[PDB]
Specification:
The structure is cut from a larger assembly and holds eight protein chains of eight kinds.
Chain B (H helix, E strand, L loop, with lengths): L17 H5 L2 E5 L7 E3 L5 E3 L7 E3 L2 H11 L8 E5 L5 E5 L46
Chain F lengths: L4 H10 L2 H12 L3
Chain G lengths: L9 H15 L5
Classes of the chains: A mainly beta (62), B alpha+beta (139), C mainly alpha (738), D mainly alpha (42), E mainly beta (80), F mainly alpha (31), G mainly alpha (29), H mainly alpha (135).
The complex binds chlorophyll A (8 copies), 1,2-dipalmitoyl-phosphatidyl-glycerole (LHG), phylloquinone (PQN) and iron/sulfur cluster (3 copies).
Chain lengths: 62, 139, 738, 42, 80, 31, 29, 135
C-alpha cells in the first residue's frame, strides 16, 4: 500500500465501506496502529473525506 | 480558599437561586490588568475590576462559558471552584493547573476502550447481565 | 433517592419530574429492570397474563351486568328491528332539562345510552332470552375472573412458580393450544350451539335444568357412533322460518345450506354448529403433530436443521437455511410477540372484512350503526396490532438477535440485502401515489372545468372477475361459478356442492353486503389503500431493518430502542431511532384506516340511503369525497345542539369537537420541541421562588418533558383525537340519517 | 322530565356511586397515589 | 452521570476537548498517534450530555461517544 | 322484567371477591 | 450459475397466473 | 362481456351530447369518445379485454415507457460521461449541453442499447463495489 494507489475499504463501521480511495500518506513509525491515510472523493456527513485506516482492512484495486 | 472583589454588576435575575444555597455553587476567580466590561453568563454586562475578581455562578457550564470569554480578553489564569453549602471549597478547573487541551503527564487513560467503536458487542451478549454493551471487557 | 420506581435504581435517584413519567412507560418492560434473571422474567409474564385475563372477564361482566340491570334486553327481544338497545344509564348530575328529555330514548323512563356495540345481537343469536341469564352469566364471569386472579397469585408462590424449562416447552404448548385451547373450546362451542342456541332459535327453552333430559336430535347420541351421520341434516329450517319461534322450524342440527337466513339476513345457526365442529376435528388433529414425552411427533429443532430431502442435499425447508431459528424464536420473547400480533392483526381485519359481508348475528344487518361501529373498531385494532407487530420486530433486532448464532441462515440473508427491500417498498409507494393522487386531481380538474366525461375511469376488471368467479352474475364474465356449465359449478365427479345453491342466492341478492358492486370509484380507493399499506410498511420495515444501524449511525444497538437522536452532528439526526420509525407509521396507520373506514362508510351510507348513484359518480374525484361525504353528512351531527334546542346527538356533537381539540393539542407536542419549553419552565420556576405567600416548593425539579416522551404524548392525543372525532361522526351520521 | 331518575332496581345507587368515584374518592386516591410516588428510601 | 467512552481510532487533534463546555475531556499521553495524545474523560460526572465533542471528532465513525444514561441534577443543567 | 333490588346488592358483595384477590395479586407482583 | 430452483417456482407462480388469466379472457372453461 | 356498453348506444351518454356547449372542448372530443366503453351513467370507462382493446391499451404503455426510459437513459449516460472526465462535481451544476444532447441522441435507441449492456453485464454494479451499512 504505497502513496497514490487506489484502495478499497473493508471497515464495516465506516461511511466509505467498499469505496475506492487514494492513499495520501503511510506512517513509517510502526507504533501508531492506523498508519495509512486514504483520501476519498465524497465527503461522509457534513465534513471530512480523509480518514486514518489500518493495513489489514484495505484491499487495493490497482 | 477563595477571595477577590466582585465586578461592578447592577444586579440581575438570571443569577443564583435556591439550588445555590442548598446543593452547590460555583465560583470563578480571575485577575485583570484592565477596567474592562464583559458579558455576564446570567444575562447583561459587568465591569471587571483590576485586582482579583470573584464571581459566583450557579452551574459549571456558566463558568466555562465565562472562561471561554476571558480567554478572548487575553486572561488565561482563571480558577473555578465548587462550593458545597457547608463551606467546602474544592478546586476543579483547571485541576492540575494546566489546561485540559494541552497534554500533561501523570494523567490516566480513564474511560478508554481498546477496540474500534464498530466492534462493540451485541446487546444479546449482555442479556440479563449488569454491564452495558459499551463496557464489555473483551477487547 | 425515592422508592418509586422500585424496579430501576437509575431512575429512583432522578431529581426531576422525569422520574414519574419514565416509571410509567418502563414499568411493564420487564427485561430492562434492575436485578432480573431469565427465570424470574418469565414468571412475571405468566402471572400478569392472569391479571390481564381477569380484566377481560371483569370487562365482559360489566357488559352483561349493565344490560341486565339498566338495559332493555327483555323489551328489545320482542321487536329487534324497531327498537334500539340500551348500553347503560346516564347519571350526569349537571344535565339541564333539555338533556334529560333528549337522552330519555328507546322507551326508557330515565336517560340512557343506545348500545352501538352489537352485544344485544350476539346474545340473541347464542340463546339468551331473559335478563336473568344475563345476570347469572355476569355473576359467573365475576367468579371466573376471581379464579384467574387467584391463579396468578398462586404461580408466584415459590412452590408453584414454574421453571424456565416449562416456559421454553414450545412443542408441548403447541399441542395443547391447538387441541385444547383452540380445538376443545371450538368443540365446546359447537356443543352450545347444538344443545342451546339452535333449539332456542326454534322456540323450545333449553336451560341448565333441561339440557340433560331433552336430546338435541330425535336420532340423538347414536347416529354418531354407528355412522349414520346424514341423520343430523335431514330436514333443515325452511325459507319461511322466523327466528326464535317454532313456526317453520326443522330438526336438523348440522346442515350446510350456505347463504343467509331469509328473515334475519344472518348465517344459519346450524351452519355455524357444523362449522365449529369441522374446525375442532381439524384442530385437534393438528395438535398431535409435535412431540411431548410419548416419543412420536415432530421436533421443531429437527425441522429447522434438516438438510436431507429424500437423498438430496437441500439447505433446509424450501432449500433455504433455517438452522438456528429454533433457539432464535424460543429465546426471544419479542420474536414470539411480533408473530403473535401479526397473526392477531390479520384475524382482526378478517373479523371486520367478514362480519359486514357475512353477518353472523340476528338482525345485525338491519342495525346500521352497530354494523358500522364494529367494522371501524376491528380495523383500527388491526392497524394497531400490525404496527406493534413491526415495533417488536425492531426490538428483536436490537435486543434479542446475535449474528454469530444466526450465521448464514434465513435471518442473515434479509439483512444482507435490506437496502433492496427498502428501495423497492419505496418504488411501489412512489408509483401508487404519483398515479393515485395524480389521477384524482386530474379527475378533480375535469369535473371542475365542466367536462366530467373527460375523467380517467379505470374499471377494476380484476376484482370484478373475483365476484364473477364466485357467483356474481351482474357483470357477465360468465366463468367459473357464473357459468353453470363449468367444472367448478357442477363438480362433475361428485356433485356435492350442497352449499352452492344457498350461496348464490346470497351473492346475487342486491340487499346484502356480500360482494358489493364494484365500480371505478372502488378501483381508486384500493390504490389509496395499497399506497397506505406500502408506505406504513416502508416506515416499519426501515425501522426494523435499520434498527442495527446504517451509515448515519452504525451503533444503533448500543443506544437502545427509544433514544432521541445522536446530536446535531453529521447533519443532524432527529428521529433516527427505531422507535421513531415505529412512530411515524402510527400517523400512516391512522391515515390508511381513515381511508379504509372512510370508504367503508361512504359506500354503505349510499346503499342504506338508497342513493347508490351518489357514490358511483362522485367518488372518482376528491371534491365529492369532501362535498358529498364530509360536508354533507356532518349536517345532522354539528346540529346536535343549536341555539334553539338539543337532541340525542348532543354528546356526539361534543365528542366530535372534543376530538378536534385533542388533535390540535397534539400538534403542540409535535411542532414545538423541548428547548422552547425548558427556557420557559426555567422562567416560571424563577417567579415561584421569588414570590411571597407561595409556600409550596417542588420536591423534584420541573423540567420540560423529554424528547421521546412528547413524541408519545403528542401521538396519544393525535390518536385519541382521531378516534373521538371519527367515532362520533360515524355514530352520529348513521344514527340520525339511517 | 326535569330530574335524573331511575326505573332500574336500586336507583339510589348511582345517586351516591357517581359522586363517590368521581369527585369524592379520587382526591383521597390521588393523595395515597402521591404518598408512595414521593416516598423516600433509606 | 453519562458515559463518555473513547476508542483507539483517536488521532490526538484535541478538538473534542476544546468543544466541551463543561471540562469533561482532557488530553493524556499515548503512543498510537503522531500527537502522542488521546482524550480521556475523568469528569464524566460533569457530562451535560450535549454531544458537542461528537460533532468535532474528525475520524470517520468518530472515536468518542456519549452514551446518555442516568441523568442527574448536574447532568441536566438545572440552575434551580 | 329487570333484576331485583337485592340482586344488585348480591353482585356488589360477590365482586368484593375479585376486588380483594386483585389486591393480593397487585402486591405479590410487588408494586 | 443457471438458476434452477429460483426458476420453476417463479414460472410456477407465473403458470398459476396464466391459468387464472386463461379463465379471465374466457379461454378455457 | 361486462355491462360497459359502448357510448354509441349508451342511453346516458347521448344526453351529454344533447345539451352541451360547442367551443372546442365538448364537440369534437365528445364525438371521439363515442367508441369508448361507458357504464350506466355515461362516463367512458377503461376496461381490459382480450383483443378489442389489445393495442388500444398498449399504445399508452409503449409510447410512455419509451420516453420514460428516454429521460432515464439520457440522464444515466450523462452521469457516466462526466465521471470518466473526472469533473463530475462541477458538471452536474453547470450542465454541459453539447454532451447532454449527445447523450440524448444516444438514448433514442435505448431498448437496443440496454440489452447490449445486460448481456455484457455492465448495466448493474456488482455487490462488492457498492457502499452499504453494517449489516
Ligand atoms: C389444554 C390445555 C391448555 C389450555 C386450555 C391452556 C390455556 C391457556 N393458556 Mg396454556 N399451557 C399449556 C396448556 C393449556 N393452556 C401447557 C401444557 C403449557 C406448558 C408449555 C402451557 C403454557 C402457557 C403459558 C406460558 C401461557 C399459557 C397461557 C394460556 C391462556 C391463553 C390466554 C388466552 O386468552 O388464550 C386465547 C383464548 C381464546 C378463546 C382463543 C380465541 C382467539 C384466537 C386468537 C382465535 C382462534 C381462531 C383460530 C386460531 C383461527 C384459525 C383456525 C384454523 C383451523 C383456520 C389460556 C387460557 C397464557 C396465560 O398464562 O394466560 C393466563 C400464557 O402466558 N399457557
Ligand atoms: C374510530 C374507530 C373506532 C370505532 C368506531 C370504535 C367502536 C367501538 N368501540 Mg373501540 N377502540 C378503538 C377504535 C374504535 N372503536 C381503538 C383504536 C382502540 C384501542 C385503544 C379501541 C378500544 C376499545 C375498547 C377497550 C372498547 C372499545 C369498544 C367499542 C364499541 C362501543 C363504543 C361505542 O358505542 O362507540 C363510541 C365511539 C368510540 C370512539 C368508542 C371509544 C371507546 C374507547 C376507544 C375506549 C378506550 C379505552 C381507554 C383507552 C381506557 C379508558 C380507561 C379509563 C380512563 C376509564 C364500539 C363498537 C367497547 C366494546 O368493546 O364494546 C363492548 C370497549 O370496551 N374499543
Ligand atoms: C363539564 C363537562 C362534563 C363533565 C365533567 C361530564 C362528566 C360525566 N359525564 Mg357527561 N356530557 C357532557 C359534559 C360533561 N360530562 C356534555 C356537554 C354532554 C352532552 C349533553 C354529556 C353527555 C353525557 C352522557 C350521555 C353520559 C355522560 C356521562 C358522564 C359521567 C362519566 C365520566 C366520563 O365518561 O368521563 C361523568 C360524571 C355518562 C354517565 O352518566 O356515566 C354512567 C354518560 O353516559 N355525559
Ligand atoms: C364438548 C362439547 C360437548 C359436550 C360437553 C356434550 C355433552 C353432551 N351431549 Mg353433545 N354434541 C356435541 C358436543 C358436546 N356434547 C356436538 C359438537 C354435537 C353435534 C354432532 C353433539 C350432538 C349431541 C346429540 C345428538 C346428543 C348429545 C348428547 C349429550 C349429552 C350426553 C348425555 C349424558 O347424560 O351423558 C351430554 C351432556 C345426547 C343427549 O341426549 O343430551 C342430553 C344426545 O342425544 N350431543
Ligand atoms: C400483546 C400486546 C403487546 C405487549 C405485551 C407489548 C409489550 C411491550 N411493549 Mg408494545 N406495542 C404493541 C403491543 C404490545 N406491546 C402495539 C399493538 C403497539 C403499536 C402501538 C406497540 C408499540 C410499542 C413501542 C413503540 C414500544 C413498545 C414497548 C413494549 C414493552 C414495554 C411496555 C412499556 O413501555 O411499558 C408500559 C406502557 C404504558 C404504561 C402505556 C403508556 C401510555 C399508552 C400510550 C396509553 C395511552 C392511552 C391514553 C392514556 C388513553 C386515553 C384516555 C381517554 C381520554 C380516551 C413491552 C414488553 C416499548 C419497549 O419495548 O421499549 C424497549 C416500546 O418502546 N410497544
Ligand atoms: C405497484 C403497482 C400496483 C399495486 C400495488 C397495485 C395494487 C392493486 N391493484 Mg393494480 N394496476 C396497476 C398497478 C398496481 N396495482 C397498473 C399499472 C394497472 C394498469 C392500469 C393496474 C390495474 C388494476 C385493475 C384493473 C385492478 C387493479 C386492482 C389492484 C388491487 C388488487 C390486486 C390486483 O389484482 O391487481 C394487480 C395488477 C398488477 C398488474 C400488479 C402490478 C405489477 C407491476 C407493478 C406492474 C408494473 C407496471 C407496468 C409495467 C405498467 C391492489 C390493491 C384491482 C382493484 O382495483 O380492486 C378493487 C383491480 O381490479 N389494478
Ligand atoms: C369493568 C367493567 C365495568 C365497567 C366499564 C363499568 C362501568 C360503570 N359502572 Mg359498573 N359494575 C361492574 C363492572 C363495570 N362497570 C360490575 C362487575 C358490577 C357488579 C359489582 C358493577 C356495579 C355497578 C353499580 C352499582 C354502578 C355501576 C356504575 C357504572 C358507571 C359509572 C361508574 C361508577 O360510578 O360506578 C363504580 C363502579 C363500581 C362500584 C364497580 C366497578 C368495579 C368492577 C367490578 C371492576 C372494574 C375495575 C377494572 C377491572 C379496573 C381496570 C382498569 C384500570 C387498569 C384502568 C359506569 C358506566 C354506576 C351506574 O350505574 O351509572 C349510572 C353504578 O352506581 N356499576
Ligand atoms: C435521470 C436521472 C435519474 C434516473 C435514471 C433515475 C432512476 C431511478 N430512480 Mg430516481 N431521482 C432522480 C433522478 C433519476 N432517477 C432525481 C433528480 C430525484 C430527486 C427528485 C430522484 C429521486 C428518486 C426516489 C425517491 C426514487 C428514485 C428511484 C429510481 C429508480 C426507479 C424509479 C424511477 O423511475 O425513478 C423515479 C423518479 C423520480 C422520483 C423523479 C426523477 C425524474 C425527474 C424528471 C428528474 C430527471 C432528471 C433529469 C434528467 C435531470 C430508477 C433506477 C426509486 C428507487 O428507490 O429505486 C427502485 C425511488 O424510490 N429516484
Ligand atoms: C401479492 C403480493 C406481492 C408481493 C410482491 C413480492 C415481493 C417480493 C418479490 C421478490 C422476493 C424474492 C424472494 C425469493 C427469492 C429467493 O429467496 O431466492 C433464494 C432461494 C434459495 O436459493 P438456494 O439457497 O437454493 O440457492 C440458489 C439455487 O437454488 C439456484 O437455483 O430460492 C428459492 O427458494 C426460491 C424462492 C421462491 C419463493 C416463492 C415460492 C413460494 C411457493 C408458494 C407455493
Ligand atoms: C407543552 C409541552 C411541554 C411542557 C409540558 C408540560 C409541562 C406537561 C405538564 C402539564 C400538566 C402538569 C399535565 C397535564 C395534565 C394531563 C391532563 C394529565 C397528565 C397526568 C399524567 C399522569 C397522565 C414539553 O415539555 C414539551 C417537550 C417537548 C416537545 C413538546 C413539548 C410541549 O409541547
Ligand atoms: S435535540 Fe432534537 S433537533 Fe437536536 S438532534 Fe436531538 S432530536 Fe434532533
Ligand atoms: S476524540 Fe476527536 S479530538 Fe479527541 S483524540 Fe480523537 S479525533 Fe482527536
Ligand atoms: S457530552 Fe458535552 S460535556 Fe460531555 S464530553 Fe460531550 S461535549 Fe463535553
Amino acid at each position: 500500500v504505497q502513496r497514490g494507489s487506489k484502495v478499497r475499504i473493508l471497515r464495516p463501521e465506516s461511511y466509505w465501506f467498499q469505496d475506492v480511495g487514494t492513499v495520501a500518506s503511510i506512517e513509517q513509525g510502526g507504533t501508531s496502529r492506523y498508519p495509512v491515510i486514504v483520501r476519498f472523493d465524497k465527503v461522509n456527513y457534513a465534513g471530512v473525506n480523509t480518514n486514518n485506516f489500518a493495513q489489514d482492512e484495505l484491499v487495493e484495486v490497482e | 480558599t477563595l477571595s477577590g472583589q466582585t465586578p461592578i454588576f447592577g444586579g440581575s435575575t438570571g443569577g443564583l437561586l435556591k439550588k445555590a444555597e442548598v446543593e452547590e455553587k460555583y465560583a470563578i476567580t480571575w485577575t485583570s490588568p484592565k477596567e474592562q466590561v464583559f458579558e455576564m453568563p446570567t444575562g447583561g454586562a459587568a465591569i471587571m475590576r483590576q485586582g482579583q475578581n470573584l464571581l459566583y455562578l450557579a452551574r459549571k457550564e456558566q463558568c466555562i462559558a465565562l472562561g471561554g470569554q476571558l480567554r478572548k480578553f487575553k486572561i488565561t489564569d482563571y480558577k473555578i471552584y465548587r462550593i458545597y453549602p457547608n463551606g467546602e471549597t474544592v478546586y476543579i478547573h483547571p485541576a492540575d493547573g494546566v489546561f485540559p487541551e494541552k497534554v500533561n503527564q501523570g494523567r490516566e487513560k480513564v474511560r478508554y476502550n481498546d477496540r474500534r467503536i464498530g466492534q462493540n458487542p451485541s446487546p444479546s451478549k449482555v442479556k440479563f447481565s449488569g454491564i452495558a454493551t459499551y463496557d464489555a471487557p473483551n477487547s | 433517592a425515592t422508592k418509586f420506581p422500585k424496579f430501576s435504581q437509575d431512575l429512583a435517584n432522578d431529581p426531576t419530574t422525569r422520574r414519574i413519567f419514565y416509571a410509567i412507560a418502563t414499568a411493564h418492560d420487564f427485561e430492562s429492570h434492575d436485578g432480573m434473571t431469565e427465570e424470574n422474567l418469565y414468571q412475571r409474564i405468566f402471572a400478569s397474563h392472569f391479571g390481564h385475563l381477569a380484566i377481560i372477564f371483569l370487562w365482559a361482566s360489566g357488559i352483561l351486568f349493565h344490560v341486565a340491570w339498566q338495559g332493555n334486553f327483555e323489551v328489545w327481544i320482542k321487536d329487534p328491528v324497531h327498537v334500539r338497545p340500551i348500553a347503560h344509564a346516564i347519571w350526569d348530575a349537571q344535565f339541564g332539562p333539555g338533556a334529560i328529555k333528549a337522552f330519555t330514548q328507546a322507551g326508557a323512563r330515565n336517560p340512557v345510552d343506545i348500545c352501538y356495540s352489537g352485544v344485544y345481537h350476539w346474545w340473541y343469536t347464542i340463546g339468551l332470552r331473559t335478563n336473568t341469564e344475563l345476570y347469572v352469566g355476569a355473576l359467573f364471569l365475576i367468579l371466573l375472573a376471581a379464579v384467574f386472579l387467584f391463579a396468578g397469585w398462586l404461580h408466584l408462590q415459590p412452590r408453584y412458580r414454574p421453571n424456565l424449562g416449562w416456559f421454553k416447552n414450545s412443542e408441548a404448548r403447541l399441542n395443547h393450544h391447538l387441541a385444547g385451547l383452540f380445538g376443545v373450546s371450538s368443540l365446546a362451542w359447537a356443543g352450545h350451539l347444538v344443545h342451546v342456541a339452535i333449539p332456542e332459535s326454534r322456540g323450545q327453552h333449553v336451560g341448565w335444568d333441561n339440557f340433560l333430559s331433552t336430546p338435541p336430535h330425535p336420532a340423538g347420541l347414536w347416529a354418531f357412533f354407528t355412522g349414520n351421520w346424514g341423520a343430523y341434516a335431514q330436514n333443515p329450517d325452511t325459507a319461511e322460518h322466523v327466528f326464535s319461534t317454532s313456526q317453520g322450524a326443522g330438526t336438523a342440527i348440522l346442515t350446510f345450506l350456505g347463504g343467509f337466513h331469509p328473515q334475519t339476513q344472518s348465517l344459519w345457526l346450524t351452519d355455524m354448529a357444523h362449522h365449529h365442529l369441522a374446525i375442532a376435528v381439524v384442530l385437534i388433529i393438528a395438535g398431535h403433530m409435535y412431540r411431548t414425552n410419548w416419543r412420536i411427533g415432530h421436533s421443531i429443532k429437527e425441522m429447522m436443521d434438516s438438510k436431507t430431502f429424500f437423498g438430496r442435499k437441500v439447505e433446509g425447508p424450501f432449500n433455504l437455511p433455517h438452522q438456528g431459528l429454533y433457539e432464535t424464536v424460543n429465546n426471544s420473547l419479542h420474536f414470539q410477540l411480533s408473530l403473535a400480533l401479526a397473526c392477531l392483526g390479520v384475524a382482526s381485519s378478517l373479523t371486520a372484512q367478514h362480519m359486514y359481508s357475512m353477518p353472523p348475528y340476528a338482525f345485525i344487518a338491519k342495525d346500521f350503526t352497530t354494523m358500522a361501529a364494529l367494522y371501524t373498531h376491528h380495523q383500527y385494532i388491526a392497524g394497531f396490532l400490525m404496527v406493534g407487530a413491526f415495533s417488536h420486530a425492531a426490538i428483536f433486532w436490537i435486543k434479542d438477535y446475535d449474528p454469530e448464532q444466526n450465521k448464514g441462515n434465513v435471518l442473515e440473508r434479509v439483512l444482507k440485502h435490506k437496502e433492496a427491500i427498502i428501495a423497492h417498498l419505496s418504488w411501489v409507494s412512489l408509483f401508487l401515489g404519483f398515479h393515485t393522487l395524480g389521477l384524482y386531481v386530474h379527475n378533480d380538474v375535469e369535473v371542475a372545468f365542466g367536462a366530467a366525461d373527460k375523467q380517467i375511469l379505470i374499471e377494476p376488471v380484476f376484482a370484478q372477475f373475483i365476484q364473477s368467479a364466485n357467483g356474481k352474475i351482474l357483470y357477465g364474465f360468465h366463468t367459473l361459478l357464473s357459468n353453470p356449465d363449468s367444472i367448478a359449478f357442477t363438480a362433475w365427479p361428485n356433485h356435492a356442492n350442497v352449499w352452492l345453491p344457498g350461496w348464490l342466492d346470497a351473492i346475487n341478492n342486491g340487499t346484502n353486503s356480500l360482494f358489493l358492486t364494484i365500480g371505478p370509484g372502488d378501483f381508486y380507493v384500493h390504490h389509496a389503500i395499497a399506497l397506505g399499506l406500502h408506505v406504513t410498511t416502508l416506515i416499519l420495515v426501515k425501522g426494523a431493518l435499520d434498527a442495527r444501524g446504517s451509515k448515519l449511525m452504525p451503533d444503533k444497538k448500543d443506544f437502545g430502542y427509544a433514544f432521541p437522536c445522536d446530536g446535531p452532528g453529521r447533519g443532524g439526526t432527529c428521529d433516527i431511532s427505531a422507535w421513531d420509525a415505529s412512530y411515524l407509521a402510527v400517523f400512516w396507520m391512522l391515515n390508511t384506516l381513515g381511508w379504509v373506514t372512510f370508504y367503508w362508510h361512504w359506500k354503505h351510507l349510499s346503499i342504506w340511503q338508497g342513493n347508490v348513484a351518489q357514490f358511483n359518480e362522485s367518488s372518482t374525484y376528491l371534491m365529492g369525497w369532501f362535498r358529498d361525504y364530509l360536508w354533507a353528512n356532518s349536517a345532522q351531527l354539528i346540529n346536535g345542539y343549536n341555539p334553539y334546542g338539543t337532541n340525542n346527538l348532543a354528546v356526539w356533537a361534543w365528542m366530535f369537537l372534543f376530538g378536534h381539540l385533542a388533535w390540535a393539542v397534539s400538534f403542540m407536542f409535535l411542532i414545538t420541541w423541548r428547548g422552547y419549553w425548558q427556557e420557559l419552565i426555567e422562567t416560571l420556576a424563577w417567579a415561584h421562588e421569588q414570590t411571597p405567600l407561595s409556600f409550596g416548593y417542588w420536591r423534584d425539579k420541573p423540567v420540560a418533558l423529554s424528547i421521546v416522551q412528547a413524541r408519545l404524548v403528542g401521538l396519544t392525543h393525535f390518536t385519541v383525537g382521531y378516534i373521538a372525532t371519527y367515532g362520533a361522526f360515524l355514530i352520529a351520521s348513521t344514527a340520525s340519517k339511517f | 322530565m326535569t330530574q335524573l331518575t331511575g326505573d332500574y332496581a336500586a336507583s339510589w345507587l348511582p345517586w351516591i356511586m357517581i359522586p363517590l368515584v368521581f369527585y369524592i374518592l379520587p382526591f383521597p386516591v390521588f393523595a395515597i397515589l402521591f404518598l408512595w410516588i414521593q416516598k423516600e428510601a433509606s | 452521570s453519562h458515559t463518555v467512552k473513547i476508542y483507539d481510532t483517536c488521532i490526538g487533534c484535541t478538538q473534542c476537548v476544546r468543544a466541551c463546555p463543561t471540562d469533561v475531556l482532557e488530553m493524556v499521553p499515548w503512543d498510537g498517534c503522531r500527537a502522542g495524545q488521546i482524550a480521556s474523560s475523568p469528569r464524566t460526572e460533569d457530562c451535560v450530555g450535549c454531544k458537542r465533542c461528537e460533532t468535532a471528532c474528525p475520524t470517520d465513525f468518530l472515536s468518542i461517544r456519549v452514551y446518555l444514561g442516568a441523568e442527574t441534577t448536574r447532568s441536566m443543567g438545572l440552575a434551580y | 322484567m329487570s333484576i331485583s333490588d337485592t340482586q344488585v346488592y348480591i353482585a356488589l358483595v360477590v365482586a368484593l371477591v375479585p376486588g380483594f384477590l386483585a389486591w393480593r395479586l397487585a402486591t405479590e407482583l410487588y408494586k | 450459475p443457471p438458476y434452477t430452483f429460483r426458476t420453476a417456482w417463479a414460472l410456477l407462480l407465473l403458470a398459476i397466473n396464466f391459468i387464472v388469466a386463461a379463465y379471465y379472457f374466457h379461454i378455457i372453461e | 362481456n361486462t355491462t360497459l356498453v359502448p357510448c354509441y348506444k349508451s342511453p346516458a351518454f347521448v344526453e351529454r351530447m344533447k345539451n352541451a356547449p360547442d367551443s372546442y372542448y365538448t364537440t369534437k372530443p365528445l364525438k371521439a369518445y363515442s367508441q369508448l366503453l361507458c357504464g350506466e351513467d355515461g362516463l367512458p370507462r377503461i376496461a381490459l379485454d382480450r383483443l378489442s382493446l389489445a393495442v388500444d391499451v398498449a399504445i399508452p404503455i409503449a409510447i410512455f415507457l419509451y420516453t420514460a426510459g428516454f429521460i432515464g437513459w439520457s440522464g444515466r449516460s450523462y452521469l457516466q460521461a462526466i465521471k470518466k472526465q473526472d469533473k463530475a462535481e462541477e458538471k452536474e451544476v453547470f450542465i454541459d449541453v453539447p454532451l447532454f444532447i449527445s447523450c440524448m441522441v444516444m438514448a433514442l435507441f435505448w431498448p437496443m442499447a440496454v440489452i447490449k449492456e445486460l448481456l455484457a453485464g455492465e448495466l448493474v454494479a456488482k455487490d462488492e463495489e457498492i457502499p452499504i451499512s453494517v449489516r
